[PDB]
């Protein structure tokens, strides 16, 4: 039949408001008061923000308001934090114990400050080496936005081969989290002095060097 | 919350029938029928394929099933077909003001051989500590299907409270790669006996454990 109409957006700004209408029909959003609103951050599990058009779980953000106007219903997200950058969904009872969901709205929160990456470079630890492999890891983290390049260096002459960068997941903030790795056999590991990892983000480059001299 | 756990990756083939489990934390379960299965596609809405334990709503083919014994609600795709590929969540009504989901499965149809992780844990670098900074990273490498569950522990006590996980990416070997971490301070690092990164990937569960045998 139909799947509730929702717009792919709600671009608010830090503090500023945003309200998300979701248009239903007679058959559902018309003749029943069973509208739920979900707050799904990318690939995660969905949570019950609004549960009966307006009314939230005792464990939801103080001002995440909602309503119904006849065939269209809404969510007054008014306390613009950024935690909530996500995909939101509506859902209405209709026929016999049947529930239909929305298209999805993709809320986006603007004028977030530029976060610039914390680069931490890792050397193979003993256990790894006991087995006679030696991988290295460049954890690129806590940044905004999420377009970054990670350039490994053998030493000068770039070791960008055997590399496996694995790009950026928003983390418990809405600040990113990328990784990249080098497979080294301990031989090459004990070959050529220093290695690098150079995370270039929005112009600001960061290069971290590990050398074989530590305490394992 | 996630007070109902699901197999991170659940998979078969065109023909392989696939059972997912939503196991309950709930000292409630049994005093319920209300387990509900929500299938999901890639940038599609959750789609409520099973209601209160047994009953499919219209257009949910009779070969999606629901069963629940003790704590574990269960669902069976009773003859996997291609676009059964999807993230399957489980709801439980719990009371009101509290409507909680499982963490989502992932029905993969295998078109590649299965690949159990290569969980390579790393310990806080010396120079890294040389700044008063202690971060552990648990590079999960080389899995298929691309879904995994990382836990972090210390001294027989789970540490839910310091971690980030990324989201499995496709490496040039069509094998997936994740990261994950526990960023802290030399105090919490130092004051402890062990630090196990645990990782689970359908069936196989591998725990790698580091120790605070630090230098300076």
């Amino acid at each position: 039949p139909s799947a509730l109409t929702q717009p792919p957006s709600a671009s608010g700004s830090l503090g500023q408001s945003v309200t998300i209408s979701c248009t239903g029909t007679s058959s559902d959003v018309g003749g029943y008061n069973y509208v739920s609103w979900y707050q799904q951050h990318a690939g995660k599990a969905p949570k019950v923000i609004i549960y009966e058009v307006n009314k939230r779980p005792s464990g939801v953000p103080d001002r995440f308001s909602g309503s119904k106007s006849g065939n269209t219903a809404s969510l007054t997200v008014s306390g613009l934090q950024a935690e909530d950058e996500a995909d939101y969904y509506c859902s209405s009872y209709e026929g016999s114990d049947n529930f239909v969901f929305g298209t999805g709205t993709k809320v986006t929160v603007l004028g977030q400050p530029k976060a610039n990456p914390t680069v931490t470079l890792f050397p193979p630890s003993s256990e790894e080496l006991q087995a006679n492999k030696a991988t290295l890891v460049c954890l690129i983290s806590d940044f905004y936005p999420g377009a970054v390049t990670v350039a490994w260096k053998a030493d000068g002459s770039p070791v960008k081969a055997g590399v496996e960068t694995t790009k950026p997941s928003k983390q418990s903030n809405n600040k990113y989290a990328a990784s990249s790795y080098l497979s080294l056999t301990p031989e090459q590991w004990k070959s050529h002095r220093s290695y690098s990892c150079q995370v270039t983000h929005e112009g600001s480059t960061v290069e971290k060097t590990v050398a074989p001299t530590e305490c394992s | 919350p996630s007070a109902l756990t699901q197999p991170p990756s659940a998979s078969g083939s065109l023909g392989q029938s696939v059972t997912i489990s939503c196991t309950g934390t709930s000292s409630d379960v049994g005093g319920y029928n209300y387990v509900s299965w929500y299938q999901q596609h890639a940038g599609k809405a959750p789609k409520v394929i099973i209601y209160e334990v047994n009953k499919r709503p219209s257009g949910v083919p009779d070969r999606f099933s629901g069963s629940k014994s003790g704590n574990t609600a269960s669902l069976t795709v009773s003859g996997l077909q291609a676009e059964d590929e999807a993230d399957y969540y489980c709801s439980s009504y719990e009371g009101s003001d509290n409507f909680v989901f499982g963490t989502g499965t992932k029905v993969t149809v295998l078109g590649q051989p299965k690949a159990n992780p290569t969980v390579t844990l790393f310990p806080p670098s010396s120079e890294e500590l040389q700044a008063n900074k202690a971060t552990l990273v648990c590079l999960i490498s080389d899995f298929y299907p691309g879904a995994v569950t990382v836990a972090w522990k210390a001294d027989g006590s789970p540490v839910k409270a310091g971690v980030e996980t990324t989201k499995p990416s496709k490496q040039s070997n069509n094998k997936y790669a994740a990261s994950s971490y526990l960023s802290l301070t030399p105090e919490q690092w130092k004051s402890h006996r062990s630090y196990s990164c645990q990782v689970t990937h359908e069936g196989s569960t591998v725990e790698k454990t580091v120790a605070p045998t630090e230098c300076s």
């Binding site: 069973y34 739920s36 549960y51 859902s91 009872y93 114990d97 529930f99 | 209300y34 009101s96 409507f99």
Partner: peptide
């Protein structure tokens, strides 16, 4: 959803 739960409703009912």
């Amino acid at each position: 959803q739960x409703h009912x």
